[PDB]
Each structure stands twice: as C-alpha cells, then as structure tokens.
C-alpha cells in the first residue's frame, strides 16, 4: 500500500487545481508516466463527496492508444475490490463507434442511404418484432436474450475491458457488443472513448445519459480539440441522399388529401429546384458561396408566404413519420435528416453555422456531386457545453509551459499547474541545420516546392551526410509526400534526376494496418531501415501514433523541412479574418505554433518521456522564428536544469559526441 514520491509532492496543489469546479490545465511528461500519474492523482479524490461521487472520462484519438490507457489502469487497480485491489475499487471500460465494434451490421443492409445510427434502429426493430412474434423469421441475428444474461454481464467488470478484445469477444458470440457496453456504461466509475463523440453537443447529451450522474473530462493531447469539434459540429446535405428520399416517399404511396395546387412530392420538387439550380450556377473548380447566397433563389422561385412554408415543413415531417413507422416494420436516415436540414434552413442557426457549396466530382458521370453544408467556422461556440454545470474539464499535452495558446483557443482562463518532476536537459539534444560555409546559398526557400537546386544541396546532401555518418535507426519526417518523393531517389524514383542513394524504407499512402507493422518489425530488428528507422514519412501521417515497444527503437529524427501548413481560400480564410479582427497576431498562433506541435508529437513519440533519451533536428531557413515563444519542446520546465541549448559549429559531430556521452551514462 503506497504511491509515488512525485504524487505525494504534487497532490495537494493538484486537489487545489481541481477545486475551482469548472476548468484547469496540467503540465506533464512527453508521454511515459503521464496517464498513470493522472490515475494516481485522481486516487486522492475517488470519493471526495460521498453523497454524489463524481466520475472520470478520458478522450482518446485512436484505438491502439486506448489499450495503453486500459493496460496501465488495469495494473493500477489490479481488481475492483480489496479482495485483490489496493488503490481504487474502480470499474473501467473501453469504448468506440458501432462502425468499429460491429462488422456484420455494416455488411448486411448494403445501400448508400444507410447511416450507422439507422442500423442500430433497424437491429432494435428486428429485436422488438422477434420478441413480439417474429423470432422464427425476422431477428437480425445480433440482438436477443444474451443482452441480459449473467455470463455476458461478468467479463465486463471482472476483466476491465479493452476495445479490440470486446470486438474479438463480440464476433463468434454473435451478439452486438456496442449495445452490451452501452447498457453496461452506468455501473462504471471510469470510461475511455473518442474525442469525436464527446465534443459534439448532441452526442454529449446522450453520453451524459449513460453516465447518469455528473463527471470530469480529461482531454489527453488537447491541441486536437478545436479541429475535431468543428469537424464534428458541421453538418451537410447530399444530392444523392435526396434523390433516394424521393423514391422512398413515392414508394410509401404519398398521401391523398393535399390541396390541388400542392403535394409532398411537389414541395420536395420546390426544395430540390433551389439546390439543383445552385449546382449549375455556383462552382466547378473553386467556390466563395456565403450564407447570403441561398435565400434569393428560394425567395424568387417559390413566390410564397410563411403559413405555406410552415405547413410544407409540417407536411415533410408527416411523410417522414409515415416512412419511419414503415421502416420499423422492415427492420433493415434521409427523410429525418431532410426534415431537419430544411427546418434549420427556413429557421436559423446563423449564430453558429454558414452554408457553403463545394466543387463536385466532374470528372466523370458519377453521383457524389457538389456537396452543400452548414460549416462551423470556429469552435468557440461549439465547445461551451463541456464547461456547463453537469460537468468539469482538465487539459494536457505533455509539454505546454508557455501556457498562452490554450487560454487563446478557450477564451477562458483555466487554473494552471505543472504536475510532474522533470529530468536534466542533457538526456535530450534539439539541433537545427542550414549550412556551414559562405557559398552554401541554396536554401532561399522563396519557392521550396519548386527549388531543385535547394532540394539537391543540403536538403538531399545533409540528410545523406548525417544518416551515413550517424549510422543509427533514424526516421526522416517530411512536410509532404511530393518532397519525400523528390528528396530520396529510392528504388522507385519520381524522376531519373533525384539526389539520395542509400537503403531507406518508404511510408506512402494506402498504408494498411498489417503493412505498417512489417516496417516497424524491420526497424526494431536490425539495420538502418524500417518504420521509425531510416525511412521517410510525412509528419502528419500515421507513423505519429508510434509503437509502444520497451526497446528504444528510435534514435534520431531529422525533420526535412519544418512541418508547416496552409489556409484554404474558403471557411479557413474566413476563420483567419476573424482571428485577425480579435488577436491581430493571428498567423503565429493560428498556423505556425499549431504546425510546430505537429512537429513536437512526432519527436515526442521518438523520445517518449523522462526514462529515455534522444535527439531531433530541424532543417529550415526560417528556423529562428520557431525557436522563439517556446513553441517546440526545447522550452523551460525547471530553472535548475542548466538549459537545453543546440548551437554548434557542426551538428553531425555534436550528435555523435552526444551518443558517446549517452553510452557512458
């Protein structure tokens, strides 16, 4: 019966950082120890108030990270009770989409108009019909009496479930695993799942239904929250989904009592006439469609009054209800999603969305076509429900010491706290490269995407000098595939004229989960080359998930170009304007800093935490700008550390001298 010296040092301050009952920010290591130490620091409050006992929820980017949260938390609990447990008598359980957990329901109802929500509705309908009478001929073979059985009930609390292993359990048994979890969610003290589910205010209302009481939420690698929340908040319409909803309403046999001038089919035709006409008129190559543009083609064509539109909205709901009851007796959703998108359109959501139409796919005589949506420009309005009275939040990303960007993104001021004991600067080394004599002029980067001489000179040549001299397993990160392809001639060259000749491995698109592992098996086993070894990958890509090997499989990472991003002349451009109006100093916060963290995740994944070591180099002309404002890992954590400096008259020599120093340690 104990806990770490670190937890004891920073418990009282962390309980205080928690007292404010709404928000806080926490600084932690690059990953190793961070999540386990959170669970150790929430052990102090596992029953802070007996009369209500709050819960913990954790938000997670991908399924392999979730098994890392489960395996650590399973070690910490050891069991649900004092019978075998000694820190937490807790219950914990993994979750993820119905789309991931269940394969057979995706396979069987094969149609374009078949939403993942709709499939649970369909499965529920077959289960009720079978229970009513229809067991001999209509259950969808995935929902029945096992739902409420003791044998099914036991593994979840005995075991402390992993998501992959629930899927393995769920196949063979032939019982919908997602529903058993969803029924089971209320009994559990802790939950681990997606960020895309939680950030969405409508899903958050259903998530909070399953918890059945108040909670805390922790965002692990929280810089992702803003891009996920707008992606999840925005909604859209599609031309094919209306063309299917129209056949389905006509198949329903419509109605027999609208007045001679109109009908449900005629009214859809009025709505469709407006969207179809924008497809011809609007865009083909590029767009600039605003929330202003839709109303005028609606207003001219219809020549209408409100009474009539209110009724047409009512009559759409009535065809949809007829359709929904009629879908339910079928057991295998567009009239609903059309009822609502039209209702939002005649209503509003102008405080939080703006409508865009976007180039289609023509090109070919396909049906994907130009897509139309209610695009959420900025997350700030969309995030607010996280802070509201049924909950409280806490945010972290390993490093975050310069603090400002999170309060900038929040428009709220959390309680701040640094809540781990860090290690000396000397185990890490963070180089930059640009040239070593006055004739080394090929790195102007006025057009780095076009400068052949610059790609051929220190961008291709320094990589080959550093990799050949420093013979260790090293992964070269690039800003795009196109750069990666030009820099390494490889076995497969984009031209005969490219300037690296050495054994490296590729990591290109159509990555495959099994194929990814083959490359990591190769890098960990031997030789320079593999995934994370002498191999090229774009910094945005999947290699950023890393591997959870004990072995220090990584050594050096050389970022060939500083990871940078762009700002599309559409909703993104509208966002840049807004943040210019508010901050002024928008470019460094909105794009540069956000790209450097993209850098820092890949390097963070290489060096892992305090119990390891490493180096990480950046190749760019503009690199000093990156060094200011502590936008990279190099920045302060404890004054006593004796600095993390990288200036030298030769990088390659300094890293080989640093590796001798590390072998000696």
């Amino acid at each position: 019966d104990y806990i770490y010296p670190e937890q004891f040092s920073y418990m009282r301050e962390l309980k205080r950082t928690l007292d404010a009952k709404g928000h806080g920010v926490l600084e932690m290591p690059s990953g190793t120890g961070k999540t386990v130490s959170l669970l150790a620091l929430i052990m102090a409050y596992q029953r802070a108030y007996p009369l209500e006992v709050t819960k913990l929820i954790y938000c997670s980017r991908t399924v392999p990270e979730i098994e890392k949260v489960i395996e650590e938390l399973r070690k910490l609990l050891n069991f649900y009770e004092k019978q075998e447990g000694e820190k937490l008598p807790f219950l914990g359980l993994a979750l993820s989409s119905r789309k991931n957990l269940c394969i057979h329901p995706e396979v069987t109802p094969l149609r374009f108009g078949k939403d993942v929500d709709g499939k649970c509705h369909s499965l529920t309908a077959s289960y009720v019909r079978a229970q009513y009478q229809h067991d001999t001929s209509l259950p969808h073979c995935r929902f029945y009496e096992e739902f409420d059985a003791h044998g099914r009930e036991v593994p979840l609390p005995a075991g402390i479930y992993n998501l992959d292993d629930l899927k393995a359990l769920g196949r063979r048994q032939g019982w919908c695993p997602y529903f058993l979890a969803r029924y089971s969610i209320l009994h559990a003290n802790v939950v681990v799942y997606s960020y895309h589910y939680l950030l969405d205010p409508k899903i958050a209302d259903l998530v909070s239904k399953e918890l059945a009481r108040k909670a805390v939420v922790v965002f692990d690698e929280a810089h992702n929250i803003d891009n996920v929340c707008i992606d999840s908040m925005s909604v859209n319409l599609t031309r094919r989904t209306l063309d299917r909803c129209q056949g389905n309403l006509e198949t329903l046999q419509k109605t027999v009592l609208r007045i001679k001038e109109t009908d449900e089919q005629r009214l859809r035709d009025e709505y469709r006439r407006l969207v179809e006409g924008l497809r011809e008129a609007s865009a083909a190559r590029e767009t600039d469609a605003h929330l202003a543009n839709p109303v005028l083609p609606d207003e001219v064509l219809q020549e209408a009054v409100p009474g009539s539109i209110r009724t047409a909205e009512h009559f759409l709901g009535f065809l949809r209800r007829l359709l929904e009851y009629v879908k339910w007796r079928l057991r295998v959703f567009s009239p609903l999603t059309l009822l609502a998108n039209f209702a939002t359109l005649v209503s509003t959501y102008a405080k939080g969305f703006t409508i865009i139409i976007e180039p289609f796919d023509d090109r070919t005589p396909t049906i994907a076509n130009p897509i139309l949506h209610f695009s959420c420009m900025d997350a700030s309005l969309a995030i607010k429900p996280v802070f509201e009275r049924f909950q409280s939040v806490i945010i972290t990303s390993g490093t975050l010491s310069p603090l400002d960007i999170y309060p900038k993104i929040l428009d709220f001021h959390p309680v701040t706290m640094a809540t781990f004991t860090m290690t000396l600067a000397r185990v890490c080394l963070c180089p930059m490269i640009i040239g070593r004599g006055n004739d080394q002029v090929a790195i102007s980067s006025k057009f780095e995407t076009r400068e052949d001489i610059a790609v051929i000179r220190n961008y291709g040549n320094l990589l080959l000098e550093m990799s050949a001299v420093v013979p260790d397993g090293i992964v070269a990160f690039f800003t795009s595939y196109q750069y990666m392809e030009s820099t390494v001639a490889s076995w497969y060259e984009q031209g005969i004229l490219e300037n690296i000749q050495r054994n490296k491995l590729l990591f290109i698109e159509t990555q495959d989960g099994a194929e990814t592992s083959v490359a990591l098996e190769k890098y960990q086993e031997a030789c320079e080359n593999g995934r994370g070894a002498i191999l090229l990958s774009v910094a945005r890509g999947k290699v950023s998930e890393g591997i959870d090997f004990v072995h220090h499989y990584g050594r050096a990472v050389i970022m060939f170009g500083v990871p940078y991003v762009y700002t599309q002349s559409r909703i993104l451009k509208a966002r840049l304007e807004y943040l210019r109006d508010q901050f002024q100093i928008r470019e460094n916060d909105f794009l540069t800093f956000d790209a450097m963290r993209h850098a820092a995740q890949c390097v963070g994944r290489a060096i892992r935490g305090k119990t390891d070591y490493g180096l990480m180099v950046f190749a760019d002309k503009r690199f000093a700008r990156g060094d200011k404002r502590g936008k990279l890992p190099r920045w302060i954590q404890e004054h006593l550390t004796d600095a993390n400096l990288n200036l030298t008259v030769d990088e390659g020599v300094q890293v080989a001298k640093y590796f001798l120093r590390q072998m000696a340690q």
Partner: protein, 475 residues
C-alpha cells in the same frame, strides 16, 4: 561642429576652410586652415579613432547598379569578402591570390557587393573578355547592355563588370590615364565612386602612379598574384590603393584530391672549363648568357627532363630570353612558344601537350606571365634566376602545376626546379627566393650534387664540344 564645413580642390591638394581642427596633420602651414594631398583621404581611421566625421555636400543623386544575384566562391575567398564587410574602407584596399583560381569572380562580386558606380581597370582586352564570361549571371538583360569602353569606342551602363578600361598612356585614346580628371570620384569631380583594379601591381610605377594620386578616390579595391617586381615598391601601394586585407591561399589547406603538393627545389650546378674566364672578364648583358648556358647546368636540365619523361610527367620549361629559349629547345628538340609563334601554331602545340601522350615537354618565354592561359602540367624547370620577381615565380608555379593522378593526396605529386650556376651573380637571388617560398608555405630544398649524371649519355661530353658553344655565345 562640421554642419558648415567647406572642403575644396587645388591642382592635386585638398584645402579645409574654417576647420574642426582634425587629428594627425600640421596646422597654419601657410594660412589658418588644414591642407592635405588628395590621396590622403584614404586615412579615414585617423578621424574614426578620434570620433570625428564628414559630409559629401558636393554629391550627385543619379542612379546606380543593383546586381541582386550571387554565386559561390572558394572557401578562403568567401572568408575574404566576409572580412571586407567587417573591415570597411578605413581598414581595406588590396587582396592577393593566384592568376588561375577565381580572381575574375572576386572582382565582379567585389563590385556587386560594394554596389557603386564603378570603373574597372585592367591590363589587357583578353582579361576583359574573361571577366565578361564570368560576369554573365549579373549582366542586365544578358547581352543588350554590356559594352567595351577603350581606344576604339565606348557605350552602355555596363560591360566587363561595370565600365572597364585600360591603364594605358600612348595618347588621347588610351583609357584611364587620359580620362583621369573627367568622371570618377563621388566627393569631387563626382560622376562615379568605386575603383576595381585587376593586376594591381601595374599602377604604382613612376608615370602610372599619377592616375591614382590625382584624385580623393572614395572606394578602391586591388587584385593581384605578382604584387611587385624585384625592387619591391609595395609600401607605396598601402597609400595608393589601401592596406592588404588578405594574403595566403596555401596549398597546405587544399591537398587531398584538391590540387597539388609541390616539392620545390633550387639546384646548384658547378661551372665547367672556360665559361668563368669569360664570366669574370665580361661585365656586360651577354654575361647573363654564360651562367644560363653553362653546360654542366644544361646537363642537369637535360637529366631532369629525361627522368620526368621516363615517368611520363608533363613538363613546362621556362626561359627568360628568346636566345636562351631557342638554344636549349632546339638542342632538346622540344617545341617552344614565344611572341612571334602564331596563335594557330601555339594552339596546335598546347593541344598536343595537353592531350597527346607523345608531347610531354615544352619551352616558353615571358609571354605566359600576366594574362595567358598557360596549360596544366606537373613539372616546372626554370633555366635561370631572372630578376623579374620572386613573386611571379610563385604565381607561375601556382597556375601551371597540378597533382599527378592516383597520388592526388600525398606529400608531393608535382615538382618545381630553379637552376643556379655556382660562383656567379645568379646565386644572389636565393636567400630571398628561399625565404619568400617558405613564408608562402612551400616545402623547398637545395640540391647540390647529381652523381647519377655521371651514369648516362647527356650533352657536352668533351671540352671541344663545350668550346664550340663558348665561341657562339661570346660573339
């Protein structure tokens, strides 16, 4: 305070009315004011140290060169431009490097960096034509604004660099000496402002010195390898152009597959019957011929050609005198090149020497020096000490010699020889030569005997043969 300070020109002197009493000069020399030579303007450090300053109220505001492009120079050459940014006109004015490693590029870069209305001084039209070939990356609209400016015509804003001209003074259509009062100078006679001198040793001579002396001349840069003739005028060049910013470029910093490690040698040769009778007795310009043609020394030169041709090395033999050149070369039946050899026949001999494995020794007169594309070889023999310039021996060695293949990173892979007749005025040049080459970083030795010259066929095998040459030389 200098906010009102006039400054003006009289014949070759600057006089300063109602003065600020500037450091380092005489006062009330003949009136209440200060008066210096024009050429003293170069001493900007003496006011800069004091914390004094001045203004160019005489200025002209017209347009100037931009030349925004850049190129890549040798590692010391860049360090040398970097230093020049560092030091500025108070502590700058000449750079010394060989006539075969990038001097044209330093001139076009020196003008593109300094960026002022410029006049370029050169020795020769061929060198203008090489600087044009160098300058094509900076040239404005490639070939529609570059022009020559000399004794036949003048046109356009630029050319071989900026406007180039020649040092010459034959009459009113030379180039720089006749025009020396019309244009140049930003501070008085104020049309241009920057001077770039190629082959800078050429200007401090007694007539020429006046081109430079009879102006204030704001910015000046000089470039050279020979730097001075045997009498050493070079203290004057500190005043005339400016102090020396660089000298080194040692082959010690460019060995391993970079260039060539030269074993330098001097060869002391003894003196055979009748030639010193006559050397001692004759005090006239013929006596130079008895110490150069001394048959014991000729036999060393022949033995040395035989050794390096037996190894198939490429050899240039230098002879300071067309008589000596032809008497050595016709006896050894190797081609020779000099003034009166035409371009067609020189380019045939030189193509044969570079690409034909049968043509491995050639003889050349003073025409190589100062502006000439001497070919590559690995062996250099000088038949005499000549009093041209110890520094030109090192320019000539440095342009001509390279590493012999496969041995490209060894202690030596190229060879220089200078032949000296013992007991003559030819010996005096050695203690200077030796000190200058070792100060230039070269390994240098003296060879005093060859007892393997007593093991093979060579010329002058008898007194009677030597007598046959002695009568011809005496005449």
């Amino acid at each position: 305070i200098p906010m009102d300070l006039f400054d003006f020109y009289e014949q070759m002197d600057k006089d300063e009315e109602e003065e600020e009493e500037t450091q380092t000069v005489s006062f009330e020399v003949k009136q209440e004011m200060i008066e210096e030579l024009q050429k003293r303007c170069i001493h900007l450090e003496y006011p800069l140290l004091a914390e004094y300053d001045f203004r160019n109220d005489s200025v002209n505001p017209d347009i100037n060169i931009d030349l925004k492009p850049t190129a890549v120079l040798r590692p010391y050459q860049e360090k040398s431009l970097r230093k020049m940014f560092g030091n500025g006109r108070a502590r700058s004015g000449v750079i010394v490097l060989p006539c075969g490693a990038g001097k044209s590029l330093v001139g076009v870069t020196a003008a593109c960096t300094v960026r002022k209305r410029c006049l370029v001084l050169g020795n020769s039209a061929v060198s203008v034509e090489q600087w044009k070939a160098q300058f094509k990356m900076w040239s404005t609209i490639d070939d529609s604004q570059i022009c020559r400016f000399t004794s036949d015509a003048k046109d356009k804003p630029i050319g071989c660099s900026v406007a180039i001209s020649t040092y010459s003074m034959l009459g009113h259509t030379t180039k720089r000496s006749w025009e020396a009062e019309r244009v140049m100078e930003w501070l008085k006679t104020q049309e241009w402002g920057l001077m770039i001198l190629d082959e800078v040793h050429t200007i401090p001579a007694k007539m020429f010195r006046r081109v430079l002396t009879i102006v204030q001349a704001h910015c000046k840069l000089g470039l050279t390898a020979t730097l001075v003739r045997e009498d050493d005028k070079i203290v004057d060049l500190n005043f005339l152009i400016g102090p020396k910013l660089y000298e080194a470029n040692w082959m010690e910093l460019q060995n391993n597959g970079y260039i060539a490690k030269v074993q330098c040698a001097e060869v002391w040769c003894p003196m055979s019957p009748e030639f010193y009778r006559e050397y001692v007795a004759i005090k006239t310009k013929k006596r130079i011929l008895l110490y150069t043609m001394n048959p014991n020394k000729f036999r060393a030169c022949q033995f040395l050609i035989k050794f390096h041709e037996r190894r198939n090395d490429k050899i240039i033999v230098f002879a300071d005198n067309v008589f000596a050149l032809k008497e050595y070369a016709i006896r050894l039946n190797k081609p020779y090149i000099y003034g009166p050899t035409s371009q067609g026949e020189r380019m045939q001999i030189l193509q044969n020497f570079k690409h034909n494995p049968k043509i491995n020794t050639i003889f050349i007169s003073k025409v190589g020096d100062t502006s000439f594309d001497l070919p590559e070889a690995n062996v250099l023999i000088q038949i005499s000490s000549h009093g041209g310039s110890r520094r030109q021996e090192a320019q000539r060695l440095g342009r001509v010699l390279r590493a012999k293949k496969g041995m490209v990173a060894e202690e030596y892979n190229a060879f220089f020889y200078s032949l000296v007749s013992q007991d003559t005025q030819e010996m005096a040049y050695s203690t200077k030569r030796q000190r200058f080459l070792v100060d230039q970083g070269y390994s240098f030795k003296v060879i005093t005997k060859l007892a393997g010259m007593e093991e093979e066929d060579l010329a002058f095998s008898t007194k009677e043969e030597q007598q046959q040459l002695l009568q011809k030389v005496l005449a």
